[PDB]
Amino acid sequence: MLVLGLNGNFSAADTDVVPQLGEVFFHDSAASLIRDGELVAAVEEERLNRIKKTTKFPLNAVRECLALAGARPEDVDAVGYYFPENHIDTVLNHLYTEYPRAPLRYSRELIRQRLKEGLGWDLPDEKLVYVPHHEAHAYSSYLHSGMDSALVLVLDGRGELHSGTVYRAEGTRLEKLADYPVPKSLGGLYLNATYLLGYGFGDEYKVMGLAPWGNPETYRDTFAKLYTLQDNGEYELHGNIMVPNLVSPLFYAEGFRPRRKGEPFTQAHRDFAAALQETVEKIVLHILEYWAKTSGHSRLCFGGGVAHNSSLNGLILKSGLFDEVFVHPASHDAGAGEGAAYAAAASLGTLERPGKRLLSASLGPALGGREQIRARLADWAPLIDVEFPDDAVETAAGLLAEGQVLGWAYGRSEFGPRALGHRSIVADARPEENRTRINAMVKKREGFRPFAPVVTAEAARDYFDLSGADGNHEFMSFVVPVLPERRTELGAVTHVDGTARVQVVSAESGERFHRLVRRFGELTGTPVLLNTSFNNNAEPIVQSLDDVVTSFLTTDLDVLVVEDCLVRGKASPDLGVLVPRFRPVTRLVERRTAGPDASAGAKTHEIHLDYDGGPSAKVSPELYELLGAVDGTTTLGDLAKTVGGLSDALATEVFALWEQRFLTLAPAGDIGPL
Amino acid sequence: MLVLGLNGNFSAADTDVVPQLGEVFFHDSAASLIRDGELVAAVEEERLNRIKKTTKFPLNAVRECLALAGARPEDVDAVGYYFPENHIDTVLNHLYTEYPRAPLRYSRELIRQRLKEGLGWDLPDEKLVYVPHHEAHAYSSYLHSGMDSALVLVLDGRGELHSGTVYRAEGTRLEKLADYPVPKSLGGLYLNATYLLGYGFGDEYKVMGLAPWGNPETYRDTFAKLYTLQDNGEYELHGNIMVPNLVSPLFYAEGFRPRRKGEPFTQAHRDFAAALQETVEKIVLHILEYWAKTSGHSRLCFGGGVAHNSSLNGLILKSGLFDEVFVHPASHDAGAGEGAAYAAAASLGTLERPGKRLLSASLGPALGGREQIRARLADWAPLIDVEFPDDAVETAAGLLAEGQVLGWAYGRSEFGPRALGHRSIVADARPEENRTRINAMVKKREGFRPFAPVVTAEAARDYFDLSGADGNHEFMSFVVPVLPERRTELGAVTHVDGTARVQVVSAESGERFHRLVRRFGELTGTPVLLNTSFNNNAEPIVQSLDDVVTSFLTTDLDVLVVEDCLVRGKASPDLGVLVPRFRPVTRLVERRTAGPDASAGAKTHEIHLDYDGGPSAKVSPELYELLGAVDGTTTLGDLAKTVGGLSDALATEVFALWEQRFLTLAPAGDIGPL
Numbered sequence A, B: 001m002l003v004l005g006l007n008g009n010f011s012a013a014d015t016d017v018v019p020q021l022g023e024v025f026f027h028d029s030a031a032s033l034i035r036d037g038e039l040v041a042a043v044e045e046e047r048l049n050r051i052k053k054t055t056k057f058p059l060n061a062v063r064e065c066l067a068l069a070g071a072r073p074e075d076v077d078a079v080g081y082y083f084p085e086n087h088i089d090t091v092l093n094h095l096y097t098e099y100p101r102a103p104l105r106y107s108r109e110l111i112r113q114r115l116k117e118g119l120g121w122d123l124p125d126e127k128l129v130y131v132p133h134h135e136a137h138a139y140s141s142y143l144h145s146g147m148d149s150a151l152v153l154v155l156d157g158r159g160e161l162h163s164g165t166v167y168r169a170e171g172t173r174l175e176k177l178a179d180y181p182v183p184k185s186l187g188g189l190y191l192n193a194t195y196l197l198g199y200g201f202g203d204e205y206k207v208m209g210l211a212p213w214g215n216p217e218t219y220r221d222t223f224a225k226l227y228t229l230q231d232n233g234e235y236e237l238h239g240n241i242m243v244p245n246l247v248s249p250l251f252y253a254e255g256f257r258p259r260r261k262g263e264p265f266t267q268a269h270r271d272f273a274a275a276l277q278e279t280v281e282k283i284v285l286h287i288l289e290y291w292a293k294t295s296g297h298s299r300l301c302f303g304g305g306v307a308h309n310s311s312l313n314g315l316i317l318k319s320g321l322f323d324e325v326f327v328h329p330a331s332h333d334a335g336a337g338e339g340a341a342y343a344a345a346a347s348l349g350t351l352e353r354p355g356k357r358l359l360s361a362s363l364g365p366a367l368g369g370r371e372q373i374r375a376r377l378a379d380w381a382p383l384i385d386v387e388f389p390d391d392a393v394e395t396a397a398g399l400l401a402e403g404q405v406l407g408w409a410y411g412r413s414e415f416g417p418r419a420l421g422h423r424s425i426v427a428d429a430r431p432e433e434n435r436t437r438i439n440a441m442v443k444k445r446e447g448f449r450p451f452a453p454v455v456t457a458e459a460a461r462d463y464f465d466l467s468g469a470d471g472n473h474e475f476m477s478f479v480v481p482v483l484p485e486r487r488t489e490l491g492a493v494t495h496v497d498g499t500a501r502v503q504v505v506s507a508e509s510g511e512r513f514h515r516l517v518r519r520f521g522e523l524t525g526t527p528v529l530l531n532t533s534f535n536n537n538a539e540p541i542v543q544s545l546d547d548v549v550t551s552f553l554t555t556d557l558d559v560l561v562v563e564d565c566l567v568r569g570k571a572s573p574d575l576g577v578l579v580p581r582f583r584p585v586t587r588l589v590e591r592r593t594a595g596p597d598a599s600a601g602a603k604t605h606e607i608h609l610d611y612d613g614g615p616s617a618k619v620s621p622e623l624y625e626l627l628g629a630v631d632g633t634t635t636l637g638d639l640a641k642t643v644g645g646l647s648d649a650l651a652t653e654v655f656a657l658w659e660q661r662f663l664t665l666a667p668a669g670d671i672g673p674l
């Protein structure tokens, strides 16, 4: 039994199903592969097409999953899709009424066209299974829990008919207990409020990071007008007929004005975030207080996008409502994609399930063999210096103890949003200053943002308060208190409220990363590291070796440790040897608007990424001419001849566009098949 | 007592308040000026920025109205805006949460900014009055009816809180009897349905033109699942949680497939339009039978945008529920803007009302003095020949009896969507072939589109069944049956169901246009003329003399009659003397997309209009280079020298862009102040 799980929309690499298809239409595209009930490969398409939370069809993810399994497309017994057929087709039909030039291609045709054109795979209709969305979420969360019975809660933005569902789980059978309609969505509520802070889709976790800086008292009674807790685990959200946002009208009427980009986060912004987070905590704990005592289950599995609210999870852990809580590293729609495979298996035969709790999210493609990685790093020689230490982990722990900030790239990439020791940036967790600088200089993000620690399993309870239920901490699912007598010691990773979104690494969850953290603790007395995701502000978590080196070279990291190679940037790196490549969404434009006296205005030149929400940047006339000559094979230095040579100014302009990922800059060639 | 009425959004000429601001956010911008209770000027902003149903701030319209009244901005005593302040500001606030770069300027500050920058007018806060939306509609519909009291029904897309409102009007007092909530919008229902026909916003009236070709029976039972008629003049529309369209999910589930662009209208599409029209009719006649009997009133004023459903209006007239019915020529939001002026007058002190029933919509700017028209037409000499007959009307009637299609342009432009003798295209109403003739080769639009007759007051009852109530027919508000013994005689203007959207012209409503239709009747025995709006497929109704000449020269009209001048196109018109000017929304673009093997891909040159739903066209590299040098003063011929001269190929390419109005093409200078 080999089964493919699919989620996302159906757009090709270079176009979308309709022009500028909204980023909210079936996002976080991913593919997962289960064999004999075990999750053998999973990767989000964003990692391969480099568009965060992408809606595009996860063609590359399917290809990578098959390769990791050693399978051909014909080996796949079934394909599950994470929504019912009528729902996804009704939404496509809606988009087609708005875009009368678009061909009437519904999901079955589009899935089969993509697999046929993209993989040479003729999928039989009888192998395609559409699955209720919250059923897919629940299967994913519960089957990886290691529990043989549980309460399973799913809360997300929405399924086909519900924003929340409660299941009883026993053996491999799911039995629905309750649901909550779409307009009560806590995902929708959190996103509605997120837009008031100058943030958008996908930024909710940043708002969660802001909330502990605020006092929930300021806006508590305002948010209380937007919901009512009702008897027997019910609740209500109070909508409005003014605009499609539950939150902005009332807060506008009370004088709250939405933050603008580039403005600071005031105390009122912080308090708003705090009152929002408390609101969702109050609702979910109300749901669970009721269903704990009603269903009688002492164990909980929590999935759906809302289960990525780690503060909420930490409160559930401390609530005492349950003895055990489990959360999957991919509780958003990539996990529903995985759950759709289990559901598809269930509908065609018997359901085979994992035999153990999931401990590792290291499930994507790896970086390559020993030899192909060494050969590819040689291709980067004009930009990097490379050492091959006898014991890279020993050396990396020493560098960390010396205050270096490291890129850390090993093996198979993490499924789900958290970096966990395979595509990480790590630093000493003790100095508070590391938080200040890694926010400001390395990740280039807001100073309020917290940093998550990783700790060895053996030392975890010396630093963090894990009391209450037994939660799984392999995937940073839970915020927990830092023990008070350790808060000064852990300056970089203790949040303003004394908590931390902890990763507890063990020899079984992540042997190499555990050894790193253990050795560091032996050197310093503190077996704790800061662990943030390996990506700059313009990209998802890095995937390939070229991704890793590119990111190292365009962030202000000290050293890169990749598959036991020690990489440093050269004193003067020769950008001219890099070959520019368009991304499938890269566009160049020369534009004139109207000018004075109805003249044609002055020319300007821009590069942009053609997808909804894509960035854009002004370019000089010389860079515009240089980039128009890009062929995929010629180096940047040879290209720059035609505009009179790669001046330092052109190299600097190119470097800034590289940092923002408007195009691919890498040595000639590639690493080859893995 | 001089009062300015305002409706629309707040965007400048060349940008929108938020980028690509949806065409549905406060559309049909307009300005109205009342003085001592009389409407002295009104024009829609679309006529001036040449963007159909524009949302942009009606700055030009305000300027034109002030000039028509001989007023300084400072002479205005009060300004009324057609929505309450909290509602429009809440919608702007919602736009601003979606665009965190947009500065937080709300409606009061934007109104003052546009008037200060645009007119030097410093508007005191005390002079700006915001109005309930359906109240503005109701004042405008009722106060121009000539009635002493009436039942007033308003049905539109939505106001701040309702989609329908019912008033009793007496003297100048409005008393609210009932309302219907936003989700019951019949404007909303009609537009949702319209999308299924490959049409969009603003195309509803085309769907109404299609409905008689269809049989309402085939989808009657399907539409019946979407609404329920209830006691006490109540009804319900049955929504869905699938997509924001009432209509598409159910019709998709029954195998209805939305029409694609360029596809013919099938019999299914025709029957769909027929069942949709029957539905809104059934609901509104159900509202009206309950409120005619409950209120006991024999007079009805019907307003809001749904009151432009001419077929519905004819059915109301024939229902016997009322003795009198009045419909305003601008019952859409431009009329709400007018009605906001009256409400502002009632707020600040005392309200004065018009002395008589409105007979003429001729309220916009005029074409100019006879001396400046002659002078400006001489500027067009390299493209046209002009005659100055002794009696243009006499000549025009003969030319029409000879079978020519005329442009007819006189005096002040029509307020509201119907042409009525001031910006019209007129032809013989007798020949059936004139429909396909003027659709295909003049309006360049669909063939099913019926044409409307204008008839003298004296002959009206010889041709049209005006029985039932006494309706006002000066504005083409009602569809009425053509008498069966006249249907063959009126071949061009009788729909497939024997009906016609008639204009009855009188010496009182439009003297010149009356004399024209009378004379043609003396010459032919048929005092009826086909009357369609003076615009091609790419523009609103033409406004200025330059608009009139441009439209005549870019359509296939035989002759243009404009202010007693007879205009024909020269055998070989010299396009080279035309000065090209960018419109404020004109953008000229060279584009490179992504290519195979990650190269810089296809190079294209395009012109487009930068507003939501704006057209675009590919251009040749040569025209791209020529249009880039447009300075607003150099002629097309002189600009063409820089690329080798105005060749026939280039002149043809430019002409096709001119026809689509991508840029302004006109002789040097302008007509000057009117």
Ligand SMILES: [Cl-]
Pocket: B174, B175, B176
């Ligand atoms: Cl009242």
Ligand SMILES: [Fe+3]
Pocket: A133, A137, A156, A157, A158, A159, A304, A305, A332, A333, A336
């Ligand atoms: Fe979900």
Ligand SMILES: [Fe+3]
Pocket: B133, B137, B156, B157, B158, B159, B304, B305, B332, B333, B336
């Ligand atoms: Fe309205």
